[PDB]
Amino acid sequence: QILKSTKQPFLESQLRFNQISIKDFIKGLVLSAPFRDLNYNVNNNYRFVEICVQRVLGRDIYNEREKIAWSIIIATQGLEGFIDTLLNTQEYLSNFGDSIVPFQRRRIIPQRSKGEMPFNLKTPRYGIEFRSKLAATQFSWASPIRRFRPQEQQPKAGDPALFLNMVQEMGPG
Amino acid sequence: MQDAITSVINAADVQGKYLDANSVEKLRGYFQTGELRVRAAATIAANAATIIKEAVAKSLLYSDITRPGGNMYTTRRYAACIRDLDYYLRYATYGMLAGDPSILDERVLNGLKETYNSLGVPIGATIQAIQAMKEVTGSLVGSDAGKEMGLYFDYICSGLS
Amino acid sequence: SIVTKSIVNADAEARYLSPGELDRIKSFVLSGQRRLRIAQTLTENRERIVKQGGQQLFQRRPDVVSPGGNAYGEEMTATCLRDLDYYLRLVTYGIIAGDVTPIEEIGLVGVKEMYSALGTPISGVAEGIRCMKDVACSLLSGEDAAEVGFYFDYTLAAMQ
């Protein structure tokens, strides 16, 4: 979702001129319109807490009750009070402060070869609870462009068309 | 009408012996692919109408069978095709789950080529429709699952020939 | 035709044809001179009856021809008018057969399976035949327009 339809060129201008911090840049990307259209509108209140804990706080959900406990902040205060409460936890301010971009904290053990399945792959933008509603549809009766003739087009094994662009090579000498 | 387990039990029973290591060796091979066949039969059930619409438009829809005179001209005759192609995509799904093509010749193949000759249905265009239908089925279920579902399509095409 | 199903009716009942059946085969063949004149009018008016038929069809259903419609582009629109030429032809058969038996087993039996399987809106093709009906009945007198229109609306009924 890094498209120039989703770039925030005025948040970027206020970060270059030292007006906002990175904590305000990270807040402005969650409250942005591309994040509400592509992510918030295809999750329920429980899976969206799992997305914003994994991407803002940098760690995984502890259990299924941490999802329940935080999803009522979105339903009663809206999305703007939920990201103020998340950014003002001491878990955030001890790790990233207001000047560091978040990251997935302690994903891989120092001597091992594998990791812990990075969080953009563990939770994509929608899941099983919205799969039976917005899952595209291979072959959808859309009436797209037609191909017209097919046995001439990629000829059968005995056809003489295969040795045509070879007839020029034989040529006259 | 036997699946892979029924065929394994029959051959092991027809000699009156128990299920030795070789009989269970194939049964374990069938249970390993049990997860693949259901998901293959899952998506085929979903895109049944879409697969048949793709096959006819890719094989015989653009040919002259549909002309006044071709074998598929009238709307009753055209409607019989997609009804007819539905069985091939459906019974092939059953063979893909059962892992044994016994159901095809039991319920599809016998009296089939002898029936199309009676009606005058072109067996040549029929097999190419199933071949094109086999080609789109490998699109959905993947490569190896398409290899499994494709293994029963040409079984129909072979016997129907 | 009226001759073939008045037979197969009395055929099934193990009997011959009644006066009610034979005074209508009689009444139909004396009607045969007037039927060929009516079908002769629609025969060499297919250029206008079809092209003006698809005239009102697109003005009333621009979705089917707009980008995304089933009959979009130079290709499908040609086939979009091809089917109207088919159904206009079957109405000429029904007028000469004195029944929709030719239209029944051609273009009507299982028609919803075809058009549903082609992605075509079956309601849209029904709108096309209605537009052809107003052009056809505008080409004939009142005594004839009660027939030529009469076979179209049967096709309208079975096509939905």
């Binding site: 001439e152 | 040919s63 002259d64 069978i65 005179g69 001209y73 009238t74 005058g120 265009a125 190419q128 | -």
Partner: peptide, 22 residues
Amino acid sequence: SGYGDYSYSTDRTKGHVNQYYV
């Protein structure tokens, strides 16, 4: 056997044969 029915001879049709260029 009906108002539309098939006979082999009236079939003028490259579909029993399959030269796909027609």
